[PDB]
Amino acid sequence: ALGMVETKGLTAAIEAADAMVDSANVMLVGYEKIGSGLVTVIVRGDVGAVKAATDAGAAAARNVGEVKAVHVIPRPHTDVEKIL
Amino acid sequence: EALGMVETKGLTAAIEAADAMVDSANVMLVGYEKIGSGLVTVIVRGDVGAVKAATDAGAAAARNVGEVKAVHVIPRPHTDVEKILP
Amino acid sequence: EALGMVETKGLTAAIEAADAMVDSANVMLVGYEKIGSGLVTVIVRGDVGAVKAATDAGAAAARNVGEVKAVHVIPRPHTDVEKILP
Amino acid sequence: EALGMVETKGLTAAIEAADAMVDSANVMLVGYEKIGSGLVTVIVRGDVGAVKAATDAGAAAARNVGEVKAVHVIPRPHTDVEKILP
Amino acid sequence: QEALGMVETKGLTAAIEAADAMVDSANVMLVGYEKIGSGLVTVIVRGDVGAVKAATDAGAAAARNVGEVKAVHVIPRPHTDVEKI
Amino acid sequence: LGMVETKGLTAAIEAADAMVDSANVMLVGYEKIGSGLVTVIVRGDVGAVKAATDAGAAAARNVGEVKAVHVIPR
């Protein structure tokens, strides 16, 4: 499963990442920068862990900065895997 | 041969469009491109009907996650365009 | 000989310009350049008449899908067309 | 060991925060990260009380030079967070 | 020679029209383009001071007709420390 | 350390050149952070830095926008 939390600002993103790893059995892949101050944090793991991680990351981050998106894909297509 | 693009503001929305597109239709995901200002384009190739179906599915899934800026299909792209694709 | 440029906000509009340019005239696609903030410049080259044709089609195609920031044609020595490019 | 962050718009504002942080308490400067759009994050590491003290001092100092966007402390961060630090 | 000339535009199209006008107008070397965000691009040339002044005025005037010129400047003999950026 | 931060690169290069020309400083940083912001950084004795940054800022204002001018002793 794939979990993403997207924030305005890097400080909110670091807090999401920490909360995600604190809250569930997930691997933190990293983050991506896309401009306009937006930062996407990415984690992988089984679907229940990714759901628990993204819900915890999004809730933590909101108190540090603005949360722009939160999403989980339980079983990404292989073509997606290839570009992640 | 057709080319389909969904451009979102936000990378979470683009990834959700990419996955919806490949899931929805017989299309190959070519890749994504970032150009700044939060803008991310995801590109698919396939027969024309498959790419219209993919891009409409991608755009609809993206809108539930984030913002869609642009959706377009070029049904018969010139061979030179392949040079600039991800 | 000339360079022709169409600069858009958005990559979808830039790819639609690119394909429309090479569809409309005997020009070669050089590629495209990103400067951040969603701004992309698609560059073609060829004979001056063909580049003028191409950039008129490309800007129109891009304005149908998105925003065009600039469209311009620069005549160049036929022995060193690309020397000024980034 | 605790991590402290001050995010500013503008680099001068950030370097001022860094100087203020390291002077104010027993903290190690981890580094700066840039995310574009003029935003820079300065990070320090130390014991939690030292980190709260530094970050306070850094933000106050930065506000006199530029704009402060975020100030935060994580008291007991996981090792994994390193993957994403400068 | 060693004078430095700079023309800064909003937009890459105006920068490349500046470079064409610059190299056409005088004996100068195009060093490159620098992107710094907010859509700003700087075009940098080197040459003797007379070539660089001519090149820079020609670039600024040519860019002004395609887009917006943000800065235009010539440094006849830059310090050695500056050569390092 | 002395810093001059500008909106525009041309103004930045002019500050750097004016600073090093005006005082006993060495150019030790040149950073881009986006949104057009460029910082040039010098090192020397406090007084040479205070006069460098003064001179850089003044020279850069004739060329473009200056956003910050700052001196950190130590």
The H or E element that residue C75 is part of is strand C67-75
Contact D80, A21 (CB under 8 A): yes
Q: How close E56 comes to chain F (CA, Å)?
A: 12
Q: Give all strands of the β-sheet with E69-75 in edge-to-edge order.
A: E29-37, E40-47, E3-10, E69-75
Interface probe, candidates A10, A39, A67, A68, chain D, greatest D C-beta count within 10 A: A10
Q: What is the resolution of this structure in A?
A: 1.7
Q: Could D84 and A15 be called an inter-chain contact, meaning their C-beta atoms sit closer than 8 Å?
A: no
Q: Is A73 on the interface with D (CB under 8 A)?
A: no
Q: Which amino acid is at F40?
A: V
Give B45's strand partners. Answer: B3, B28
The answer for residues whose C-beta is within 8 angstroms of residue C79's C-beta and 6 or more apart is: none
To the nearest 10 degrees (0 to 180), the angle between helices A10-23 and A47-62 is 140
Residue A45: domain span: 1-84
Q: Could B11 and A32 be called an inter-chain contact, meaning their C-beta atoms sit closer than 8 Å?
A: yes
Q: Is the Cα dihedral C21, C23, C28, C31 positive or negative?
A: positive
Q: How close C58 comes to chain E (CA, Å)?
A: 15
Going by the DSSP 8-state scheme, the letter that residue B83 receives in this structure is G
Q: Whole-angstrom Cα distance, residue C20 to residue A81?
A: 32
Helix, coil or strand: residue C72:
strand
Q: Could F39 and D66 be called an inter-chain contact, meaning their C-beta atoms sit closer than 8 Å?
A: no
Residue B34: Cβ within 10 Å count: 19
Q: Is D29 on the interface with F (CB under 8 A)?
A: no
Give F5's strand partners. Answer: F39, F68
3-state secondary structure D20-81: HHHHHCCCEEEEEEECCCCEEEEEEEECHHHHHHHHHHHHHHHHCCCEEEEEEEECCCCHHH
Q: Whole-angstrom Cα distance, residue D79 to residue D43?
A: 15
C3 chain-E contacts, CB cut-off 8 A: 16
Q: Is A35 on the interface with C (CB under 8 A)?
A: yes
Instruction: Chain C: list its partners (3+ Cβ pairs within 8 Å).
Output: A, B, E
To the nearest 10 degrees (0 to 180), the angle between helices F46-61 and F9-22 is 140
Backbone phi, psi, residue A77, to 5°: -55, 145
Residue C85: Cβ within 10 Å count: 16
Instruction: Chain E: list its partners (3+ Cβ pairs within 8 Å).
Output: C, D, F
Contact B72, B2 (CB under 8 A): no
Going by the DSSP 8-state scheme, the letter that residue C38 receives in this structure is T
Domain count, chain E: 1
Backbone phi, psi, residue D85, to 5°: -95, 160
Q: How close D42 comes to chain F (CA, Å)?
A: 13
Counted across chains D and F, CB pairs separated by less than 8 A come out at 50
Q: Is C7 on the interface with E (CB under 8 A)?
A: yes
The H or E element that residue D8 is part of is strand D2-9
Q: Is D38 on the interface with E (CB under 8 A)?
A: yes
CATH number of the structural domain spanning residue C60: 3.30.70.1710
- Which has the closest alpha carbon to D84: E77, F25, A39? A39
Q: Is F68 on the interface with D (CB under 8 A)?
A: yes
Q: Is F14 on the interface with E (CB under 8 A)?
A: yes
- Which has the closest alpha carbon to F35: B58, B79, D34, B66? D34
The answer for residues whose C-beta is within 8 angstroms of residue F34's C-beta and 6 or more apart is: C36, D34, D36, D37, D38, D39, E36, E37, E38
Measured CA to CA in angstroms, residue E85 lies from D1, E56, F10, F12 at distances of: 38, 20, 12, 11
Contact B73, B52 (CB under 8 A): yes
Q: Could C36 and E35 be called an inter-chain contact, meaning their C-beta atoms sit closer than 8 Å?
A: yes
- Which has the closest alpha carbon to A31: A45, A20, A21, A17? A17
Residue E61: Cβ within 10 Å count: 15
